[PDB]
Amino acid sequence: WPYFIIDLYHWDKHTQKEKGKIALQVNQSYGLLRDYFELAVTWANEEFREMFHGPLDRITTYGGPTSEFLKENGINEVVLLDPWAEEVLSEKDFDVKAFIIGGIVDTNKKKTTPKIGEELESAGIKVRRRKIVLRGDVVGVPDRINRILGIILKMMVEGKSMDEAVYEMQ
Ligand SMILES: C[S@@+](CC[C@H](N)C(=O)[O-])C[C@H]1O[C@@H](n2cnc3c(N)ncnc32)[C@H](O)[C@@H]1O
């Protein structure tokens, strides 16, 4: 029912190896979502479509800004999965019609995801910045795009607690 959007913002600033890792994690995110239930990829340029080794016809790919995609589908509020957020994701956020995971890979960390939120709010989108924690700490939480999606799906579909979902995906 809800959209799981992978924001490919930052794409052209990545190396070819990092692009391949992002595309792989998107492919794994699709197969994982295929084992549950609606996967959307914004800023989805032609190079990503060429690197994506999965069924492009089975996912939603939008080449332009995430905000435009959200507005075209009547979504004014989203949940942005952000490890730097101060508030933890909870069941009070599962009524939102779109969850956004940043198409980001590290090579050592940097504060990259909240810039997506600032961009969305600058375009008029209400953004709930939500972090996933294990025992109140982001340490131990896998940050791969597919792993974050798996944690969310285990909480939303299987009713697992966050600690259970994180540890199972850890
Ligand atoms: C490899 S992480 C990127 C980490 C990068 N240092 C940053 O600050 O965005 C890829 C995506 O997974 C999501 N993510 C990773 N860890 C998270 C966490 N602990 N809580 C919520 N979202 C997380 C973020 O949305 C991020 O865009």
Curated annotation (Swiss-Prot):
Cystine pairings recorded for this chain: none
Compartment annotation: Cytoplasm
Domain SAM-dependent MTase TRM10-type: 1-170
Function, in words: Catalyzes the S-adenosyl-L-methionine-dependent formation of either N(1)-methyladenine or N(1)-methylguanine at position 9 (m1A9 or m1G9) in tRNA.
Entry similarity comment: Belongs to the class IV-like SAM-binding methyltransferase superfamily. TRM10 family.
Name under which the protein is recorded: tRNA (guanine(9)-/adenine(9)-N1)-methyltransferase
Native source species: Thermococcus kodakarensis (strain ATCC BAA-918 / JCM 12380 / KOD1) (Pyrococcus kodakaraensis (strain KOD1))
